[PDB]
Amino acid sequence: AIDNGALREEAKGVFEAIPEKMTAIKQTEGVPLTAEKIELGKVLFFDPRMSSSGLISCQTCHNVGLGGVDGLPTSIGHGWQKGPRNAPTMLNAIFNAAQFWDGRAADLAEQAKGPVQAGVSNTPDQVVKTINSMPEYVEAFKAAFPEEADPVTFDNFAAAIEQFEATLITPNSAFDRFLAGDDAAMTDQEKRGLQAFMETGCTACHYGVNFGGQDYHPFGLIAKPGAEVLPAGDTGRFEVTRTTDDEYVFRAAPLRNVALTAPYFHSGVVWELAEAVKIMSSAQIGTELTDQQAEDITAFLGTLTGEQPVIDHPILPVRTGTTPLPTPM
């Protein structure tokens, strides 16, 4: 066992490296990324005054220094949520065709907007009024949206953030460098894991540029008896189960930077990556791993960690006399 050329050839049939840099989005030549929109989006992403309490920004739950996530079990950040979910990483989110953790199959079907806009309530008006009250924001929106008479809209808020989101990509992980042609980029163990990941059927669901993130499956995590009275490391506390009549579905989690984004699953109840791998060894989904395979895939998944964005923290617009006051709650 262990031919690099064979392994690379096989991995190239199913995965793709993350690009070094994005130049446009929404190619279906798409929409040019521009410095002005990117910078406004960054400002918006870090501004806690876009929340009612004035403490919560996108950066709070999708923290760029912590793998694009908050490292906590669950939160509620978007109107489309039925309940609390683990925050997915913003890193590489631009590549995910499937935009939600879970839903009724037939409802996710005819659903266009992502989490930022889905459904979106009072918020848009409240966001715009907050933006309008600060002249530095108004000036920024006019520069980012030069062809727009009326540029401070919730759609434009969402558009500027999406442009910033497109810069939050993590090229040059060990796996990507292996893929490009560097044999020494991965260990023997990590290569054994790549091989096992591909042969045991994980790729049915975790494939393409993001190793997941593209489609939904009638399978999701549940607690076994006493899960909440058992050691947070303890094996066999949770397992995956097929939903009844396949009617409810979960997105196959995009596994890029997975080593950075514990805890795991839609409920954020698993803290060890090895345990998440063992849980995805299941007769029900059609994957079974030996102890060895589980160990090697775990080591493999560490190679999906890319170069983290280096981001200057923005200086936020000063509030003015009629900026809406934050709510205590």
Size of the site for a second copy (CB under 8 A): 37
55 binds a second copy (CB under 8 A): yes
Provide the mask over 71-110, with x wherever binding to a second copy is found by CB under 8 A and - wherever it is not.
Answer: xxx-------------------------------------
Taking a C-beta distance cutoff of 8 angstroms, is the pair 217, 265 a contact?
no
Residue 57 Cβ vs a second copy, minimum distance, rounded to whole Å: 9
Return the number of the residue (138 or 204) whose C-beta is nearest ligand HEC. 204
What is the CB neighbour count within 10 angstroms for residue 102? 17
Distances (CA, A) of 116 to 34, 90, 92, 194: 20, 12, 16, 34
Q: How does DSSP assign 156-218, residue by residue?
A: HHHHHHHHHHTT------HHHHHHHT-GGGS-HHHHHHHHHHHHTTGGGTS-BTTTS-S-EES
Among 57, 59, 63, 86, binds Ca ion (CB under 5 A): 86
Told to check if 70 binds a second copy by CB under 8 A, we report: yes
How do beta strands 238-242 and 219-223 pair?
antiparallel
Gap between the Cα atoms of 137 and 279, Å rounded? 47
State the minimum distance, in angstroms, from the CB of residue 1 to a second copy: 29
Near ligand HEC by CB under 6 A: residue from 277, 295, 299, 302:
277
**Contact of residue 259 among Ca ion, ligand HEC, a second copy, none (CB under 5-8 Å per partner type):** a second copy
Question: Considering beta carbons, is residue 98 or 159 the nearer one to Ca ion?
Answer: 98
Q: Is-contact 116 154, C-beta < 8 A?
A: no
Query: Per CB under 8 A, does 300 bind a second copy?
Result: no
Q: At its nearest, how many Å lie between a second copy and the CB of residue 64?
A: 6
DSSP string, 74-86: -B---TT-SS-BP
* Residue 63 touching a second copy (CB under 8 A): yes
Each residue 259-298 as x (binds a second copy by CB under 8 A) or -, in order, gives: xx-x--------xx--------------------------
Subset of residues 170 to 209 that bind ligand HEC, contact rule: CB under 6 A: 200-202, 204-206
The helix (H) or strand (E) run that includes residue 139 is helix 135-144
Q: Residue 186 touches which of a second copy, ligand HEC, Ca ion, none (CB < 5 to 8 A by kind)?
A: none
Question: With CB under 8 A as the contact rule, which of the stretches 57-65, 141-149, 211-219, 234-242 interacts with a second copy?
Answer: 57-65
Contact 237, 223 (CB under 8 A): yes
Residues paired with residue 32 on neighbouring β-strands, in sequence order: 24
Dihedral class, residue 282 (left if φ above 0, else alpha if ψ from -120 to 50, else beta): beta
Cα dist. 250→85, 219, 240 in Å? Answer: 12, 6, 11
Which phi and psi (to 5°) does residue 183 adopt? -60, -35
**Closer residue to ligand HEC (CB): 17 or 269:** 269
Can you read off the two tokens belonging to residue 41? 């989006």
The residues of the shown chain that bind ligand HEC, judged by CB under 6 A, are: 56, 58, 60-62, 75-78, 81, 85, 87-88, 90, 93, 96, 99-101, 114-116, 161, 200-202, 204-206, 217, 219-221, 250, 252-253, 255, 258, 261, 264-266, 276-277, 280-281, 285, 287, 289, 297
The residues of the shown chain that bind a second copy, judged by CB under 8 A, are: 46-49, 54-55, 60, 63-67, 70-73, 232-233, 259-260, 262, 271-272, 308, 310-316, 318-319, 321, 325-326, 328
The residues of the shown chain that bind Ca ion, judged by CB under 5 A, are: 86, 261
